[PDB]
Amino acid sequence: EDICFIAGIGDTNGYGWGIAKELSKRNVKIIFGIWPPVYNIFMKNYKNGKFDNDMIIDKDKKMNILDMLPFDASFDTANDIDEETKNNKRYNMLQNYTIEDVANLIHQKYGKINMLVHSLANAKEVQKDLLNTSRKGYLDALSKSSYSLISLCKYFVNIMKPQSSIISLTYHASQKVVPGYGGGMSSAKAALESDTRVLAYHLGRNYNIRINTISAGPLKSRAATAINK
Amino acid sequence: EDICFIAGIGDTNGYGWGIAKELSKRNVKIIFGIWPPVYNIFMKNYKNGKFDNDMIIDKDKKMNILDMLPFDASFDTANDIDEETKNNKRYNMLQNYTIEDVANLIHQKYGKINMLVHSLANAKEVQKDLLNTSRKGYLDALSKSSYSLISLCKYFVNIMKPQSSIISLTYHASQKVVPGYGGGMSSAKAALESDTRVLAYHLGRNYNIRINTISAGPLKSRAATAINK
Amino acid sequence: YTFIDYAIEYSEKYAPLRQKLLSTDIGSVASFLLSRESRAITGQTIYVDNGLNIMFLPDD
Amino acid sequence: YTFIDYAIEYSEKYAPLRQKLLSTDIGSVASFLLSRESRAITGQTIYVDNGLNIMFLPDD
Ligand SMILES: NC(=O)c1ccc[n+]([C@@H]2O[C@H](COP(=O)([O-])OP(=O)(O)OC[C@H]3O[C@@H](n4cnc5c(N)ncnc54)[C@H](O)[C@@H]3O)[C@@H](O)[C@H]2O)c1
Ligand SMILES: NC(=O)c1ccc[n+]([C@@H]2O[C@H](COP(=O)([O-])OP(=O)(O)OC[C@H]3O[C@@H](n4cnc5c(N)ncnc54)[C@H](O)[C@@H]3O)[C@@H](O)[C@H]2O)c1
Ligand SMILES: Cc1ccccc1-c1ccc(Oc2ccc(Cl)cc2Cl)c(O)c1
Ligand SMILES: Cc1ccccc1-c1ccc(Oc2ccc(Cl)cc2Cl)c(O)c1
């Protein structure tokens, strides 16, 4: 009986899905955190059987999806939630999708978990190069793709068993320049990779919990296609 | 039906042994290459069941050891054996212990294998610090601890299936200074971590074989103790 | 053909390992990292990229 | 009391992970690397050391 929250999935073409498939090989219960703007699209697609083939784990099991929850890594607690998204067509019919709200929901419904996956990133200005990126744009890259990992950790540690484990995904652009990977996404990954260490000391010393990040090579997912050079 | 050759077991207190235990858990077949200085004594102890408590994989699993072979990583082919060591008390009785020879032996008894482990090091002057290491000792450290890997690869690469995987052990003193890790041991691990990349290029492109290195924390093995500090 | 198609094409031409990189390739690594099998690894950036990250210069 | 005893002591005091580091802790990582589960990883130095290598300064 092991549970893994995977934060950051909008379809089955990304890394979050591959991670779900392989965890299933080990019978782990999977809970998805989905960015609200694409949560209803996702539920519909799922309900309409678009993911059935993609759910089959070779070994004649279906992916065991415990639950699928709206989740927005821009918002730590209920009172970070700004008015315009409170009235946003996509958000206002969903509730409890801030990082703290979903920690609580999950804990209330299923108890403690022992596996956490950060697998999301965003940067409004990824199409611009670093030099031409604005403060607002840069900081959104960092907030959504880097701070989001710290915040996840802080809220979830409390609902996780000790010896539990945490990953996130990164890209080599943090260490070696890849032109096109703009908007401060490279900066964000640099920070993410350094925060993984610092988080590892704190989580390690205080909770005996582990944290690492995987630097993946390229896959044609939604966000990857959204880069565009 | 996986088979692993583990190069560098002398007792059950090292990483070699722990690697053999964990590999058993997966039911992979284990073949040991033992250094002739400790070979007869390792065999003897094994025969007397000294290793019986040690071969216990909790799960009512006994370690399964396919074979045990004499093996010296200083020697590439039989023509590299100098007369003196050829006549030595410890080596005189044994044969087929060069890197080339054990490859062939293994390939005759059992066919191609698919896992290879390099878990060995040596350096005549480990006790001396880098500045005070002689040419001879330095070159010994690289020969025994770094080249041995490359050469293990040249020969074993032909008795391994495509998709096979090779690993060695390293230590952080290659990247950061630990005084007392002398003899050019630090140099040898730096070289070994560099050769791990180069070889991964050649092995990947040409054989579809992977190689990595594990940088382990300190463990109280026989070799560890022989560093008088 | 955009940026990701360049990166995938470069990777598949130049990475030590020739095979197509699957999300499940990353998945089996995350699986392992999330398990007790890796109890002694933490604070690491682990590269799952068919080795591309080790190359300096191309061959073509 | 030797070099290796200083090493163990320092690591058990200062590493992110406090557990004693075991031969079988490396062994299981070795096992994963050797298996197909790591088919996209090559050329790497993977640290298995309770995270000691990420530390710059002690605290105490
Ligand atoms: N695709 C690649 O080639 C590649 C390479 C290296 C690293 N990565 C990393 O993998 C991770 C997953 O991305 P992917 O490439 O599989 O694409 P993806 O589109 O599958 O996943 C990214 C997800 O982040 C979600 N998201 C965006 N903003 C959010 C927010 N504010 N709150 C909550 N969720 C949000 C999106 O809905 C999307 O589902 C990312 O960290 C990415 O940087 C990808
Ligand atoms: N123990 C540690 O703290 C530690 C830390 C990091 C890395 N390592 C590395 O792990 C590897 C294994 O070392 P260990 O600590 O298990 O010590 P060990 O003494 O248990 O293992 C070394 C073995 O290699 C064998 N050997 C030495 N020279 C040989 C040769 N020329 N040919 C064939 N066999 C030979 C010895 O017989 C011995 O059994 C080494 O590469 C070491 O550098 C050890
Ligand atoms: C850009 C690139 C080049 C080569 C390999 C991977 C990648 C790559 C693809 C998608 C990636 O994911 C994202 C990239 C940018 C943004 Cl805005 C969001 C996400 Cl999820 C990534 O971080 C890197
Ligand atoms: C020196 C050290 C400091 C802290 C932790 C481990 C180690 C450590 C112990 C044994 C090691 O293995 C050897 C070191 C030197 C030699 Cl001559 C042979 C071996 Cl097998 C090692 O590479 C590193």
XYZ file of C-alpha atoms and ligand atoms in Angstrom:
712
model
C 0.000 0.000 0.000
C 2.062 2.921 -1.353
C 0.753 6.211 -2.649
C 2.327 8.629 -5.041
C 1.131 12.115 -5.817
C 2.228 13.149 -9.312
C 1.839 16.910 -9.730
C 1.791 18.051 -13.366
C 0.002 16.117 -16.037
C -2.400 17.368 -18.725
C -2.305 14.368 -21.015
C -0.399 11.145 -21.637
C 2.412 12.497 -23.794
C 4.550 13.865 -20.975
C 6.889 12.523 -18.331
C 4.275 12.474 -15.561
C 2.431 9.759 -17.496
C 5.530 7.636 -18.062
C 6.270 7.908 -14.345
C 2.718 6.803 -13.509
C 3.021 3.802 -15.830
C 6.252 2.534 -14.241
C 5.144 3.084 -10.689
C 2.102 0.934 -11.530
C 4.438 -1.954 -12.340
C 5.166 -1.856 -8.554
C 1.460 -1.637 -7.559
C 1.716 1.929 -6.263
C -1.501 3.948 -5.995
C -1.303 7.027 -8.176
C -2.942 10.398 -7.576
C -2.694 13.066 -10.277
C -2.495 16.781 -9.665
C -3.770 18.617 -12.730
C -3.393 22.326 -13.550
C -6.996 23.620 -13.263
C -7.208 25.141 -16.801
C -6.888 21.682 -18.336
C -8.529 19.593 -15.568
C -11.981 19.345 -17.151
C -10.506 18.591 -20.566
C -8.554 15.839 -18.882
C -11.502 14.348 -17.012
C -13.568 14.313 -20.194
C -10.842 12.658 -22.227
C -10.428 10.104 -19.433
C -14.167 9.453 -19.044
C -14.480 9.134 -22.857
C -11.842 6.364 -22.840
C -9.047 8.224 -24.697
C -6.448 6.968 -22.182
C -7.491 3.313 -21.902
C -4.762 2.012 -24.225
C -2.260 4.278 -22.539
C -3.234 2.887 -19.130
C -2.427 -0.753 -19.803
C 0.719 -1.834 -18.018
C 2.143 -4.515 -20.272
C 1.694 -7.080 -17.515
C -2.105 -7.153 -17.830
C -2.918 -4.609 -15.144
C -4.725 -1.336 -15.619
C -3.006 1.744 -14.192
C -4.396 2.030 -10.673
C -5.452 5.676 -10.515
C -6.573 6.369 -6.937
C -7.806 9.918 -7.801
C -7.386 12.963 -10.018
C -7.402 16.398 -8.441
C -7.129 19.971 -9.667
C -3.783 21.453 -8.637
C -2.140 24.767 -9.377
C 1.442 25.257 -8.240
C 1.130 29.088 -8.504
C -0.845 29.194 -5.263
C 0.409 28.039 -1.845
C -2.645 28.549 0.328
C -6.274 29.561 -0.133
C -5.442 33.206 0.490
C -2.897 33.522 -2.329
C -5.719 33.026 -4.752
C -6.238 36.271 -6.769
C -9.655 37.745 -7.734
C -9.339 37.395 -11.528
C -8.799 33.627 -11.315
C -11.483 33.386 -8.616
C -13.800 34.701 -11.411
C -11.967 32.807 -14.177
C -14.288 30.611 -16.274
C -11.986 27.592 -15.707
C -11.215 28.005 -12.002
C -14.385 29.249 -10.319
C -16.197 25.903 -10.607
C -13.307 24.078 -8.927
C -12.184 24.328 -5.339
C -9.282 23.278 -3.077
C -6.614 23.345 -5.776
C -3.872 25.306 -3.982
C -0.840 23.325 -2.828
C -1.959 23.332 0.782
C -5.548 22.575 -0.139
C -4.513 19.452 -2.024
C -2.115 18.258 0.671
C -5.117 18.384 2.996
C -7.671 16.844 0.638
C -5.361 13.904 -0.094
C -4.504 13.363 3.587
C -8.185 13.610 4.556
C -9.180 11.036 1.946
C -6.372 8.495 1.870
C -4.046 9.002 4.829
C -0.298 9.523 4.542
C 1.566 9.001 1.265
C 5.201 8.080 0.713
C 6.033 9.227 -2.800
C 5.856 12.690 -4.314
C 6.571 13.774 -7.871
C 7.044 17.310 -9.056
C 6.649 17.154 -12.844
C 5.558 20.500 -14.084
C 7.075 23.725 -15.255
C 5.916 27.019 -16.725
C 7.308 30.334 -17.884
C 5.169 32.928 -19.603
C 8.107 34.218 -21.659
C 9.893 31.009 -22.644
C 9.765 32.199 -26.272
C 12.024 35.215 -25.490
C 15.676 34.861 -24.697
C 17.033 35.471 -21.205
C 18.272 38.964 -22.068
C 14.853 40.007 -23.326
C 12.893 38.466 -20.491
C 11.127 40.847 -18.100
C 11.225 40.655 -14.307
C 7.599 39.596 -14.220
C 8.303 36.846 -16.780
C 11.474 35.584 -15.119
C 9.884 35.525 -11.679
C 6.884 33.600 -12.997
C 9.315 31.029 -14.358
C 10.910 30.732 -10.939
C 7.649 30.730 -9.022
C 5.869 28.182 -11.110
C 8.872 25.942 -11.896
C 11.175 26.280 -8.900
C 9.440 27.702 -5.835
C 6.583 25.341 -6.556
C 8.910 22.470 -5.553
C 9.867 23.959 -2.230
C 6.203 24.681 -1.422
C 5.071 21.194 -2.390
C 7.692 19.879 -0.001
C 6.708 22.063 2.880
C 3.049 21.183 2.702
C 3.415 17.502 1.897
C 6.149 16.563 4.321
C 3.446 16.527 6.997
C 1.318 14.006 5.159
C 4.193 11.690 4.290
C 5.690 8.747 6.148
C 9.375 8.919 7.064
C 11.742 7.241 4.599
C 9.401 8.550 1.987
C 10.796 9.971 -1.231
C 10.460 12.915 -3.614
C 11.535 13.698 -7.166
C 11.284 16.462 -9.698
C 12.391 16.792 -13.351
C 15.044 19.131 -14.722
C 16.928 19.880 -17.933
C 20.688 20.237 -18.699
C 20.161 23.836 -19.922
C 20.683 24.788 -16.236
C 24.366 23.802 -16.611
C 25.101 24.264 -20.321
C 23.565 26.886 -22.537
C 20.831 25.731 -24.816
C 19.759 28.719 -26.952
C 15.962 28.745 -27.215
C 15.348 27.531 -23.699
C 14.362 31.049 -22.689
C 12.174 33.026 -20.304
C 14.303 32.106 -17.327
C 13.416 28.448 -17.616
C 17.193 27.697 -17.581
C 17.493 29.869 -14.458
C 14.522 28.077 -12.961
C 16.111 24.677 -13.518
C 19.432 25.935 -12.132
C 17.579 26.983 -8.978
C 15.615 23.718 -8.874
C 18.782 21.681 -9.062
C 20.394 23.720 -6.211
C 17.214 23.693 -4.102
C 17.209 19.873 -4.449
C 20.449 19.830 -2.507
C 19.421 22.283 0.150
C 16.035 20.580 0.518
C 17.882 17.238 0.732
C 19.814 18.416 3.828
C 16.738 19.771 5.622
C 14.338 16.957 4.696
C 17.120 14.480 5.311
C 18.146 15.698 8.721
C 14.685 16.530 9.995
C 12.438 13.891 8.445
C 14.688 11.219 7.050
C 13.004 11.961 3.753
C 14.933 11.892 0.451
C 14.846 14.214 -2.542
C 16.476 14.019 -5.960
C 15.826 15.377 -9.432
C 16.050 13.704 -12.827
C 17.630 15.562 -15.680
C 15.743 14.181 -18.642
C 16.583 14.430 -22.318
C 14.004 15.552 -24.821
C 10.521 14.205 -25.267
C 7.749 15.623 -27.466
C 5.220 16.546 -24.751
C 2.666 19.397 -24.778
C 4.973 21.883 -22.990
C 7.960 20.950 -25.144
C 5.951 21.722 -28.314
C 4.922 25.010 -26.687
C 8.555 26.122 -26.517
C 8.973 26.919 -30.218
C 12.240 28.235 -31.706
C 18.811 -15.517 -17.370
C 21.212 -12.706 -16.381
C 24.819 -13.415 -15.523
C 27.133 -11.034 -13.726
C 30.912 -11.203 -13.413
C 31.962 -9.368 -10.255
C 35.676 -8.423 -10.324
C 37.057 -7.763 -6.834
C 35.709 -9.868 -4.017
C 38.143 -10.983 -1.325
C 35.780 -11.425 1.595
C 32.254 -10.470 2.622
C 33.142 -7.095 4.141
C 33.430 -5.119 0.857
C 31.060 -3.555 -1.684
C 31.624 -6.486 -4.042
C 29.813 -8.778 -1.627
C 26.924 -6.388 -0.998
C 26.600 -6.121 -4.808
C 26.482 -9.913 -5.004
C 23.802 -10.079 -2.279
C 21.525 -7.510 -3.987
C 22.046 -9.092 -7.381
C 20.929 -12.456 -5.965
C 17.717 -10.830 -4.770
C 16.963 -10.446 -8.510
C 18.045 -14.035 -9.236
C 20.922 -12.961 -11.399
C 23.764 -15.517 -11.686
C 26.967 -14.468 -9.941
C 30.559 -15.310 -10.950
C 33.417 -14.069 -8.760
C 36.866 -13.095 -9.946
C 39.111 -13.339 -6.876
C 42.634 -11.922 -6.618
C 45.197 -14.778 -6.279
C 46.784 -13.364 -3.151
C 43.468 -14.148 -1.331
C 41.964 -16.827 -3.557
C 42.849 -20.076 -1.855
C 41.808 -18.585 1.446
C 38.504 -17.313 0.162
C 37.744 -20.714 -1.388
C 38.730 -22.446 1.860
C 36.472 -20.233 4.024
C 33.581 -20.692 1.603
C 34.016 -24.450 1.692
C 34.052 -24.356 5.545
C 30.810 -22.356 5.475
C 32.392 -19.232 7.010
C 30.228 -17.199 4.655
C 27.001 -18.971 5.514
C 25.538 -16.280 7.789
C 26.758 -13.770 5.245
C 25.096 -15.483 2.243
C 21.687 -15.045 3.866
C 19.301 -12.856 1.904
C 16.815 -12.454 4.785
C 13.878 -13.566 2.585
C 14.747 -17.256 3.235
C 16.956 -16.823 0.178
C 20.446 -18.296 0.074
C 23.010 -16.529 -2.151
C 23.451 -18.411 -5.410
C 27.041 -18.390 -6.683
C 27.584 -19.705 -10.187
C 31.402 -19.935 -9.989
C 34.606 -18.614 -8.425
C 37.673 -17.863 -10.466
C 41.171 -16.633 -9.841
C 41.633 -13.249 -11.481
C 44.223 -10.541 -11.539
C 43.308 -7.234 -13.180
C 46.995 -6.188 -13.646
C 47.252 -8.700 -16.439
C 45.603 -8.232 -19.829
C 46.719 -11.354 -21.694
C 48.871 -14.332 -20.682
C 51.844 -12.765 -22.379
C 51.642 -9.889 -19.882
C 52.434 -12.242 -17.029
C 56.067 -11.709 -15.968
C 58.095 -14.813 -15.030
C 58.344 -13.906 -11.336
C 54.650 -13.660 -10.571
C 54.111 -16.622 -12.944
C 56.335 -18.651 -10.566
C 55.074 -17.074 -7.372
C 53.811 -19.290 -4.526
C 50.274 -17.888 -4.908
C 50.026 -17.934 -8.715
C 52.012 -21.006 -9.626
C 49.080 -23.381 -9.231
C 46.395 -21.190 -10.810
C 45.849 -20.398 -14.493
C 43.530 -18.463 -16.816
C 43.504 -15.462 -14.514
C 44.375 -12.677 -16.960
C 41.658 -10.389 -18.173
C 41.622 -11.994 -21.612
C 41.742 -15.542 -20.201
C 38.859 -15.205 -17.716
C 36.760 -13.698 -20.463
C 37.294 -16.798 -22.635
C 36.823 -19.200 -19.734
C 33.511 -17.577 -18.851
C 32.499 -17.550 -22.514
C 33.184 -21.290 -22.783
C 31.436 -22.484 -19.637
C 28.424 -20.195 -19.823
C 28.093 -18.206 -23.054
C 27.726 -14.414 -23.297
C 26.901 -12.561 -20.091
C 25.231 -9.200 -19.625
C 26.402 -7.671 -16.384
C 29.947 -6.749 -15.426
C 31.177 -5.279 -12.170
C 34.514 -3.649 -11.460
C 34.933 -3.422 -7.738
C 38.678 -3.272 -7.263
C 41.465 -0.817 -6.579
C 45.053 -0.939 -5.465
C 47.953 1.420 -4.983
C 51.329 0.637 -3.534
C 51.766 4.104 -2.028
C 48.295 5.005 -0.730
C 49.958 5.797 2.581
C 52.040 8.561 0.996
C 50.494 11.869 0.028
C 50.337 12.954 -3.632
C 53.402 15.254 -3.534
C 55.471 12.412 -2.098
C 54.229 9.645 -4.365
C 56.857 8.269 -6.753
C 56.273 7.846 -10.479
C 56.175 4.095 -10.010
C 53.530 4.192 -7.273
C 51.382 6.727 -9.120
C 51.447 4.637 -12.264
C 50.675 1.558 -10.203
C 47.548 3.293 -8.851
C 46.350 4.151 -12.353
C 47.249 0.789 -13.821
C 45.533 -1.225 -11.118
C 42.534 1.052 -10.430
C 41.774 2.821 -13.687
C 43.257 0.972 -16.686
C 42.005 -2.324 -15.341
C 38.503 -1.037 -16.026
C 39.222 -0.084 -19.608
C 40.867 -3.407 -20.277
C 38.130 -5.363 -18.497
C 35.893 -3.667 -21.004
C 37.883 -4.378 -24.175
C 37.777 -8.112 -23.554
C 34.435 -8.640 -21.831
C 32.699 -6.473 -24.356
C 32.901 -9.434 -26.747
C 31.291 -11.890 -24.379
C 28.405 -9.510 -23.530
C 25.050 -9.237 -25.273
C 23.951 -5.891 -26.643
C 22.035 -4.001 -23.930
C 24.394 -5.225 -21.231
C 25.556 -2.922 -18.454
C 28.869 -2.373 -16.675
C 29.638 -0.556 -13.414
C 32.691 0.411 -11.353
C 33.094 2.046 -7.905
C 34.607 5.458 -7.307
C 35.206 7.905 -4.463
C 34.608 11.675 -4.070
C 38.334 12.499 -3.455
C 38.578 12.586 -7.223
C 36.470 15.757 -7.210
C 37.301 17.228 -3.738
C 40.421 16.872 -1.660
C 40.485 14.283 1.078
C 43.967 14.313 2.617
C 45.069 10.759 3.351
C 43.601 9.398 0.132
C 47.063 9.333 -1.381
C 49.252 7.217 -3.588
C 47.588 8.775 -6.578
C 44.361 7.007 -5.599
C 42.566 10.315 -6.040
C 44.145 10.669 -9.476
C 43.037 7.155 -10.395
C 39.405 7.836 -9.441
C 39.455 11.102 -11.425
C 40.759 9.130 -14.391
C 38.204 6.380 -13.825
C 35.289 8.935 -13.765
C 36.598 10.484 -16.981
C 37.092 7.034 -18.687
C 33.552 6.197 -17.612
C 32.272 8.914 -20.014
C 34.601 8.142 -22.892
C 33.909 4.433 -22.684
C 30.160 5.138 -22.512
C 30.460 6.899 -25.819
C 32.388 4.059 -27.495
C 30.408 1.248 -25.894
C 27.045 2.854 -26.514
C 27.598 3.711 -30.171
C 29.281 0.433 -31.098
C 27.858 -2.224 -28.767
C 24.728 -0.694 -27.300
C 26.381 -1.306 -23.871
C 26.157 1.090 -20.970
C 28.665 1.966 -18.290
C 28.374 4.016 -15.137
C 30.291 4.521 -11.918
C 29.056 4.585 -8.325
C 30.715 7.041 -5.955
C 30.213 5.300 -2.604
C 30.401 6.681 0.907
C 32.894 5.178 3.358
C 32.566 1.512 4.328
C 34.776 -0.527 6.694
C 36.151 -3.012 4.199
C 39.525 -4.736 4.171
C 41.016 -2.254 1.642
C 39.650 0.724 3.605
C 41.604 -0.338 6.701
C 44.880 -0.684 4.807
C 44.939 3.100 4.559
C 47.028 3.687 7.688
C 45.944 7.066 8.925
C 9.581 21.809 -37.075
C 10.310 23.767 -33.849
C 12.779 23.463 -31.035
C 11.853 20.123 -29.498
C 12.143 18.399 -32.867
C 15.675 19.723 -33.246
C 16.580 18.544 -29.750
C 15.112 15.075 -30.280
C 16.834 14.760 -33.669
C 20.206 15.937 -32.284
C 19.895 13.658 -29.289
C 19.173 10.624 -31.467
C 22.059 11.409 -33.792
C 24.663 12.228 -31.158
C 23.825 10.606 -27.829
C 26.060 7.692 -26.770
C 22.889 5.568 -26.773
C 21.062 5.380 -30.114
C 17.586 4.332 -28.952
C 14.473 6.538 -28.884
C 14.100 7.997 -25.409
C 10.729 7.004 -23.934
C 8.881 8.645 -21.056
C 8.903 5.203 -19.460
C 12.734 5.267 -19.585
C 12.486 8.221 -17.265
C 9.669 6.448 -15.429
C 11.677 3.384 -14.489
C 14.330 5.685 -13.074
C 11.849 7.707 -11.042
C 10.388 4.395 -9.897
C 13.730 3.369 -8.553
C 14.498 6.765 -7.012
C 11.159 6.718 -5.233
C 11.784 3.290 -3.734
C 13.802 1.996 -0.800
C 16.282 0.522 -3.308
C 17.788 4.004 -3.475
C 17.699 4.771 0.288
C 21.279 6.030 0.129
C 20.871 8.550 -2.705
C 19.683 12.072 -2.053
C 20.257 15.647 -3.232
C 21.298 14.350 -6.638
C 20.674 15.423 -10.192
C 20.404 12.089 -12.044
C 20.760 12.212 -15.832
C 18.412 10.060 -17.861
C 19.128 11.272 -21.353
C 20.846 8.420 -23.234
C 24.166 9.976 -22.110
C 23.925 13.073 -24.291
C 25.087 15.237 -21.382
C 28.627 13.768 -21.450
C 29.513 14.867 -25.007
C 31.490 17.997 -25.787
C 31.915 17.871 -29.559
C 29.763 16.075 -32.196
C 31.280 13.810 -34.868
C 29.392 15.332 -37.820
C 41.826 4.750 14.923
C 42.571 5.217 11.168
C 41.373 7.091 8.150
C 38.279 4.996 7.445
C 36.958 5.456 10.997
C 37.224 9.238 10.744
C 35.423 8.924 7.384
C 32.540 6.806 8.738
C 32.178 8.987 11.797
C 32.142 12.214 9.806
C 29.620 10.836 7.377
C 27.295 9.505 10.051
C 27.436 12.886 11.746
C 27.284 15.250 8.803
C 25.432 13.514 5.975
C 21.891 14.533 5.117
C 20.891 10.918 5.850
C 21.859 9.666 9.314
C 21.569 5.911 8.750
C 24.675 3.708 8.755
C 25.781 3.255 5.129
C 25.649 -0.386 4.130
C 27.338 -2.495 1.488
C 23.886 -3.553 0.381
C 22.887 0.098 -0.061
C 25.388 0.384 -2.874
C 24.523 -3.125 -3.952
C 20.940 -2.312 -4.762
C 21.943 0.781 -6.732
C 24.471 -1.372 -8.559
C 21.644 -3.787 -9.232
C 19.397 -1.084 -10.727
C 22.206 0.304 -12.919
C 22.976 -3.173 -14.199
C 19.360 -3.852 -14.986
C 17.252 -2.628 -17.900
C 15.439 -0.219 -15.565
C 18.288 2.212 -16.157
C 18.439 1.767 -19.938
C 18.682 5.566 -20.532
C 21.556 6.257 -18.061
C 25.180 5.913 -19.184
C 28.501 7.652 -18.576
C 27.446 8.861 -15.168
C 28.941 9.045 -11.721
C 26.015 8.223 -9.405
C 26.598 9.123 -5.745
C 25.444 6.660 -3.131
C 26.640 8.093 0.149
C 23.645 9.422 2.133
C 24.161 12.749 0.335
C 27.451 13.738 2.032
C 28.822 15.086 -1.261
C 26.342 17.978 -1.412
C 27.548 19.517 1.859
C 29.982 22.448 1.873
C 30.256 23.372 5.511
C 29.494 21.446 8.687
C 27.098 23.033 11.204
C 28.570 21.860 14.481
N 9.835 17.211 -22.516
C 11.088 17.254 -22.312
O 11.881 17.030 -23.360
C 11.697 17.535 -20.942
C 13.083 17.485 -20.736
C 13.598 17.731 -19.447
C 12.748 18.044 -18.372
N 11.415 18.109 -18.601
C 10.517 18.440 -17.479
O 9.490 17.460 -17.264
C 8.452 18.043 -16.465
C 7.072 17.658 -17.037
O 6.908 18.301 -18.296
P 6.667 17.518 -19.686
O 7.726 17.931 -20.676
O 6.335 16.059 -19.427
O 5.364 18.299 -20.271
P 3.826 18.191 -19.751
O 3.051 19.225 -20.561
O 3.475 16.726 -19.739
O 3.815 18.567 -18.172
C 3.944 19.894 -17.672
C 2.689 20.118 -16.857
O 2.805 21.248 -15.989
C 1.460 21.680 -15.791
N 1.436 23.029 -15.192
C 1.866 24.166 -15.786
N 1.710 25.228 -14.948
C 1.171 24.772 -13.792
C 0.802 25.354 -12.603
N 0.960 26.697 -12.438
N 0.283 24.574 -11.629
C 0.123 23.248 -11.792
N 0.465 22.606 -12.924
C 0.993 23.319 -13.952
C 0.864 21.637 -17.191
O -0.565 21.544 -17.157
C 1.476 20.368 -17.752
O 0.551 19.279 -17.619
C 8.742 19.544 -16.466
O 9.412 19.904 -15.250
C 9.725 19.728 -17.612
O 10.526 20.900 -17.417
C 10.896 17.851 -19.833
N 35.229 1.056 1.242
C 35.031 2.254 0.923
O 34.835 3.147 1.864
C 34.976 2.698 -0.506
C 34.481 3.975 -0.766
C 34.395 4.402 -2.077
C 34.818 3.552 -3.081
N 35.292 2.333 -2.815
C 35.695 1.519 -3.961
O 34.972 0.278 -4.035
C 35.830 -0.727 -4.597
C 35.935 -1.980 -3.726
O 36.690 -1.696 -2.550
P 36.239 -2.226 -1.087
O 36.157 -1.043 -0.170
O 35.068 -3.156 -1.299
O 37.551 -3.012 -0.588
P 37.756 -4.604 -0.697
O 39.183 -4.838 -0.290
O 36.602 -5.278 0.010
O 37.651 -4.818 -2.283
C 38.834 -4.728 -3.076
C 39.034 -6.091 -3.716
O 39.731 -5.988 -4.949
C 40.658 -7.081 -5.016
N 41.802 -6.709 -5.863
C 42.733 -5.791 -5.566
N 43.637 -5.694 -6.561
C 43.274 -6.555 -7.544
C 43.768 -6.915 -8.796
N 44.889 -6.344 -9.307
N 43.103 -7.860 -9.496
C 41.993 -8.464 -9.030
N 41.465 -8.171 -7.834
C 42.055 -7.228 -7.063
C 41.100 -7.371 -3.600
O 41.415 -8.762 -3.509
C 39.847 -7.018 -2.824
O 39.040 -8.183 -2.666
C 37.180 -0.078 -4.786
O 37.230 0.367 -6.127
C 37.163 1.142 -3.894
O 38.011 2.184 -4.383
C 35.382 1.870 -1.560
C 13.381 22.635 -24.512
C 14.059 21.245 -24.538
C 15.132 21.058 -25.423
C 15.740 19.797 -25.447
C 15.211 18.844 -24.560
C 14.166 19.171 -23.755
C 13.657 20.234 -23.726
C 12.556 20.442 -22.852
C 11.236 20.179 -23.332
C 10.143 20.461 -22.484
C 10.380 21.000 -21.181
O 9.323 21.299 -20.382
C 8.888 22.644 -20.375
C 9.580 23.710 -21.064
C 9.102 25.041 -21.001
C 7.924 25.326 -20.271
Cl 7.194 26.952 -20.367
C 7.225 24.271 -19.581
C 7.719 22.933 -19.638
Cl 6.887 21.568 -18.834
C 11.688 21.297 -20.713
O 11.887 21.836 -19.471
C 12.772 21.021 -21.555
C 39.446 6.835 1.535
C 37.950 6.847 1.897
C 37.536 7.942 2.669
C 36.189 7.998 3.023
C 35.401 6.939 2.556
C 35.955 5.936 1.835
C 37.070 5.898 1.498
C 37.485 4.771 0.747
C 37.795 3.524 1.399
C 38.296 2.455 0.603
C 38.487 2.651 -0.803
O 39.005 1.674 -1.596
C 40.403 1.617 -1.763
C 41.273 2.703 -1.463
C 42.672 2.566 -1.661
C 43.223 1.360 -2.158
Cl 44.982 1.188 -2.328
C 42.369 0.262 -2.468
C 40.967 0.427 -2.263
Cl 39.862 -0.898 -2.641
C 38.210 3.882 -1.446
O 38.423 4.020 -2.795
C 37.711 4.935 -0.666
